[PDB]
A paper describes a structure:
Single-stranded RNA bacteriophages (ssRNA phages) are positive-sense RNA viruses that have shown specificity for gram-negative bacteria by exploiting host retractile pili, including T4P6. Acinetobacters have type IV pili (T4P), which are involved in twitching motility, surface adhesion, biofilm formation, and natural transformation in gram-negative bacteria. Our study delves into the interaction between Acinetobacter phage AP205 and type IV pili. Using cryo-electron microscopy, we solve structures of the AP205 virion with an asymmetric dimer of maturation proteins, the native Acinetobacter type IV pili bearing a distinct post-translational pilin cleavage, and the pili-bound AP205 showing its maturation proteins adapted to pilin modifications, allowing each phage to bind to one or two pili.
To investigate the recognition mechanism between AP205 and T4P, we employed single-particle cryo-EM to obtain a structure of the AP205/T4P complex. The two copies of Mat exhibit different conformations: One Mat (referred as outer Mat) extends further to elevate its apical domain away from the capsid shell while the other Mat (referred as inner Mat) is embedded deeper within the capsid and has a larger bending angle between the central and basal domains. Within the T4P-Mat complex, the apical domain of each Mat specifically plugs into the groove formed by three adjacent pilin subunits within the T4P (referred to as Pilins 1, 2). Notably, the C-terminal Ser147 of Pilins 1 and 2 are positioned near β3 and β7 of the Mat apical domain, respectively. Apparently, glycosylation at these two serines can prevent binding of AP205 Mat. It is likely that the substoichiometric glycosylation of pilins allows AP205 to bind to unglycosylated sites on the T4P. We also observed that the internal cleavage site of Pilin 3 at Ser79 is located at the binding interface for the apical domain. This cleavage allows Ser79 to move ~13 Å away from Gly78, allowing its interaction with β8 of the Mat. In the natural environment, during the interaction of AP205 with A.gp16, it is plausible that multiple T4P from the same cell come into close proximity. This allows the pair of Mat proteins from a single phage to simultaneously bind to two pili, as shown in the major class of our single-particle cryo-EM structure of the in-vitro reconstituted AP205-pili complex.
Numbering used by the authors:
A (entry chain a): 1 to 49
B (entry chain BD), E (entry chain AZ), F (entry chain BC), H (entry chain AY), I (entry chain BF), K (entry chain BA), ...: 79 to 147
C (entry chain a): 147 to 195
D (entry chain AH), G (entry chain AG), J (entry chain AI): 9 to 78
């Protein structure tokens, strides 16, 4: 039975993540943001997710 | 003018050396530039995936719409 | 790339779509597409032990 | 007028802010497409060499050096 | 030049010596190839029964439909 | 960034899955748009027969010559 | 220089309005031709099998899988 | 793969069982084929007298001179 | 200082929030202004179309040529 | 005011000093690229004539005059 | 027109009259060509073994990727 | 109005004839220009390599920032 | 859209019905074209031997280098 | 506000209909203009070649250096 199935443990951190620094400089859900590079996140959090 | 060394001291080119480096063209203002931005920098960063974007360290008011991060 | 949500929200500070991994910067799992994934076709057959 | 000149500054700001379509993906595909055609042409000589039974040293290859290292 | 040795460093021919050994023609990108796809290899492997197929290690979006794994 | 899902909110794509449905690229103005054009839309209509056409909901004056219909 | 930037926008607007040729026929015509060669290559196998008197099961086919399913 | 059964489901072989019926080699597009002609078929029919000819279900603009019947 | 909040209590600007309302810049006389004109206002309003006009509540004799109602 | 007009003049002078990004290199590479295709387009004619054994005069060139003289 | 003589003065064909001499297809710029490369030459040389290669007298800045020799 | 001769004698065009000479576009003030600069000239020169630069004989205090040479 | 019947009134196709007559592709400006070139025509003619050339009826300054004839 | 119908009677637009007529933008003084120049007119005309020129019927002493014609 042909069956498309997702493949776990074959996913990679392709680096497309574009974190945004809110120009408000705080936890405001609104306001302008600064889409930054993936470098700004701790790699531990990346691995956990 | 070559990428390794340019003809202007205010212009620097970050030439990638492998497939994982991110290119950047950095230009430091001066000479005929304003006194306030006599030493500010404007950089166009190029992600290895093929994405071009602009950044600068000068005030947000002074940023144009395109380089508004 | 598709999806980046259904991850560990721990550490992130949720501000609507914004997950502030820092006081200043946030991410959006809707477009935080750093995750390349994989799926495969699968031909399968039910068996009785 | 100052309003006229300020507008021109905005236009340059708008015009220079065009999105890059990521031409790296476009170029890379063509090079791979070029290479496989070259390596594809080597199939006939290897196939004919094998069907004649000649050794690897005896199999004359009409390969020309490629700028993409083949 | 020859199957045993070629005039190009990046081109290798896996010539079989027996009836049950497959044939492979593999080339490695370099020189004027893209920095992103640099050092990658594309191989055309031949089954002993005479079936030809193509394989490569380049990214999924860069793989042509004729060499997709 | 794939056809199914894009990296920008303002862009959506109708992928034609059959031979009798048309393709369209929808880009909705926003972010740094002009206040009059906060919510107008323009589409790139791709007919199944191989014809490309452009249409917009903006006022007549703002319409460029290539999208007047 | 307000009038100067208009010509820049006008040319871009004109260039963005270039007629895109209907390339669909080119690929579809070419694709069938690839099927044309692939399907006709088995005629020699089919004709030899018919003339020798072998059945459908006894006819050895040196077919290779085609990405176009043809 | 053989005449009775092939390794590709889009390839169909109609092998005659007597001296009065005709042979047919029918191939159905798909996978890497175009969306418009994704479900069309190209067939090679052979008369009992030994004459080979082609037919196709694609539109006229895609029919080559070989199968333009 | 900013359109939302200004550094002088005698200057106000109405910034539109959508495309169906008008913009306006309003200024009220005071301090060094004459006692007769101490409490009227001069406004610069921008229509949704983007047309700028000047209006004032001062007497007809004190109105400039460009702000004649 | 005189100061507001001085801002306009300075901006015009600022705009008038935009760097010219040496457009000679770009077109010259493209102009050679077009000629590059023209010279290689006649290789097929020459290769066949050499292999078929035709003389220089017996070889028919399907060459059309190029405005770049290449 | 012919290999012995071409219809354009800037196009010259060197035909090999024997098996131990090479062939050359030399094209000289001009007319609509740039003034900087007005009198440069680009040539195709083929060894008697049948190996083709590219050569030109233009500067390294203008040289294409396939003629860096 | 061609490069060989201009519409007015106050504008001169130096058209290069080969690839080893520089071009010049020189304009002389006058008519409605200031009396104190009635005979000064403003010239634009282009290097053979393709570099454009400005020069003028007016005093420094009248020079713009782009022609301070 | 056929050669005998095109989809646009501004496009004219002359199909050679014999081996001794030429093929031509005529395109007349208009609609969105410049008023100065509102009624001009640009044609591509083919000799029966297979040689292509371009002719244009606009002024020489509007003629590009390709159709300068 | 269009070329065919101006918003006010003091401005008139000469919009050419073919490639041989000339565009002209005529503005007649009045309203808040001086009594002496109450009925004077100012016109911007454009030749079909693409050249703009200024003409005014105001007195010589009131003509600026821009329109000294």
């Amino acid at each position: 039975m042909n069956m498309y199935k997702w493949v776990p443990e074959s996913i990679r951190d392709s680096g497309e993540g574009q974190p945004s620094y809110s120009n408000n400089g705080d936890y405001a859900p609104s306001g302008p943001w600064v889409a930054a590079g993936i470098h700004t996140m701790p790699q531990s959090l990346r691995d956990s997710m | 003018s070559t990428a390794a060394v340019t003809g202007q001291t205010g212009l620097t080119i970050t030439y990638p050396a492998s497939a994982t480096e991110s290119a950047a063209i950095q230009g430091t203002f001066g000479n005929s530039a304003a006194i306030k931005i006599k030493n500010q920098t404007l950089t166009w960063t190029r992600t290895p995936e093929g994405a071009w974007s602009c950044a600068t360290t000068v005030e947000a008011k002074f940023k144009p719409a395109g380089c508004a991060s | 790339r598709i999806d980046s949500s259904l991850a560990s929200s721990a550490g992130f500070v949720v501000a609507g779509e914004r997950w502030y991994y820092t006081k200043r910067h946030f991410i959006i799992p809707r477009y935080f597409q750093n995750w390349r994934m994989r799926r495969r076709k699968y031909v399968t057959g039910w068996v009785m032990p | 007028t100052l309003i006229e000149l300020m507008i021109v500054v905005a236009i340059i700001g708008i015009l220079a802010a065009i999105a890059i379509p990521q031409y790296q993906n476009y170029i890379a595909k063509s090079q791979v497409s070029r290479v496989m055609s070259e390596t594809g042409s080597l199939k006939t000589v290897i196939e004919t060499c094998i069907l004649d039974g000649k050794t690897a040293a005896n199999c004359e290859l009409g390969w020309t050096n490629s700028n993409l290292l083949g």
